[PDB]
Amino acid sequence: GVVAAAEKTKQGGVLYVGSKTKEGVVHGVATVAEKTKEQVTNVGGAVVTGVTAVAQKTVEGAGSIAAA
Amino acid sequence: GVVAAAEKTKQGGVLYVGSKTKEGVVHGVATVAEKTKEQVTNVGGAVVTGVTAVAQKTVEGAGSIAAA
Amino acid sequence: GVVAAAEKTKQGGVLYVGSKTKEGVVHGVATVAEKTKEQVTNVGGAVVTGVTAVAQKTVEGAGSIAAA
Amino acid sequence: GVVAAAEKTKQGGVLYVGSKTKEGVVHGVATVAEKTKEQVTNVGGAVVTGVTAVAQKTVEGAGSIAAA
Amino acid sequence: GVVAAAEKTKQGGVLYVGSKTKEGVVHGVATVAEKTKEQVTNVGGAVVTGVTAVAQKTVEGAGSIAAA
Amino acid sequence: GVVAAAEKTKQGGVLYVGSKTKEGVVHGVATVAEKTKEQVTNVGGAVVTGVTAVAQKTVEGAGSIAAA
């Protein structure tokens, strides 16, 4: 087997973005393989894909991953 | 078997986005493989796929993954 | 097996971006390999993909990963 | 097996970007290899991808990684 | 096996960029190899990719890495 | 086996450069080698890729690395 865990505790801003382009296909996070036995795809934290996407102060949480 | 867990505890903003392209397709997070025996896709945290989607202050939780 | 974990605790700004370009495909973070036995894809913290994407004060959390 | 972890504790801006270029695809962080047995891909901290991306005071957390 | 970790504690501005150039593809940080057994990709701290990208006071956090 | 770690504590600006030149592809930090068994890619601190990119007072945290 394999193990992982996390927790959070706590005890105690303007931004301008105008987008402009005529074309672009976009992929966030990816991998590919033919003839491949153990394709394992793992993702955590904060992630998004968009022709525009913006990351103000985005992560206050915590985390981890493991495999194989 | 295989193991993970978490939970969250606690003891105690302007942004502009204008979209512009007419259409051009987007896929957020994915992976591909022909001829694959141990085909595993695993996902956590905060995720969306959309032509625009935005990540203001998004993650307060916690989490983790394992497989094989 | 493999093990990982993390936590957060706590005890105690203007920016201009105007985009302009005529075309661009964009991929955030990616890798590729044919004929691969142990294809492992892992990501943490904060990452986002867009023809524009901006990272004000983005990470207040903490984290780590391991595999194989 | 392999182990990693981290934590944050705490006890106690004017910038302009004008974008202008006519074309240029962008990729953030990436690597590639054919015939490759143990492709292992890992990332953390704060990283983002676009034709322009700006990193104001962006990292206030902590972390690390290990594999193989 | 292998180990890594880090932490942060704490106890206690104008700049101009106008971009102008006619074309440029840009890649943040990358490496490549055919015929490779132990392809390992690791990144930390703060890094971002753009045809223009600017780093005011970007790191207050801390970190390290190790592998294989 | 292998080990690494670090930490930070604490207890106790005008500049003009406007960009103009006609073309440039730019890569931040990279290396390549075919027929290479132990391709190991590790990076820290802050570095950013852009045809013009400016680093006022950018890294005030700390770190170091080793692998294999």
UniProtKB/Swiss-Prot annotation, chains A, B, C, D, E, F:
<feature type="region of interest" description="4 X 11 AA tandem repeats of [EGS]-K-T-K-[EQ]-[GQ]-V-X(4)">
    <location>
        <begin position="7"/>
        <end position="44"/>
    </location>
</feature>
<feature type="modified residue" description="Phosphoserine">
    <location>
        <position position="64"/>
    </location>
</feature>
<protein>
    <recommendedName>
        <fullName>Alpha-synuclein</fullName>
    </recommendedName>
</protein>
<comment type="similarity">
    <text>Belongs to the synuclein family.</text>
</comment>
<feature type="repeat" description="4">
    <location>
        <begin position="34"/>
        <end position="44"/>
    </location>
</feature>
<comment type="subunit">
    <text>Soluble monomer. Homotetramer. A dynamic intracellular population of tetramers and monomers coexists normally and the tetramer plays an essential role in maintaining homeostasis. Interacts with UCHL1. Interacts with phospholipase D and histones. Interacts (via N-terminus) with synphilin-1/SNCAIP; this interaction promotes formation of SNCA inclusions in the cytoplasm. Interacts with CALM1. Interacts with STXBP1; this interaction controls SNCA self-replicating aggregation. Interacts with SNARE components VAMP2 and SNAP25; these interactions allows SNARE complex assembly and integrity.</text>
</comment>
<feature type="binding site">
    <location>
        <position position="27"/>
    </location>
    <ligand>
        <name>Cu cation</name>
    </ligand>
</feature>
<feature type="repeat" description="3; approximate">
    <location>
        <begin position="19"/>
        <end position="33"/>
    </location>
</feature>
<comment type="function">
    <text>Neuronal protein that plays several roles in synaptic activity such as regulation of synaptic vesicle trafficking and subsequent neurotransmitter release. Participates as a monomer in synaptic vesicle exocytosis by enhancing vesicle priming, fusion and dilation of exocytotic fusion pores. Mechanistically, acts by increasing local Ca(2+) release from microdomains which is essential for the enhancement of ATP-induced exocytosis.</text>
</comment>
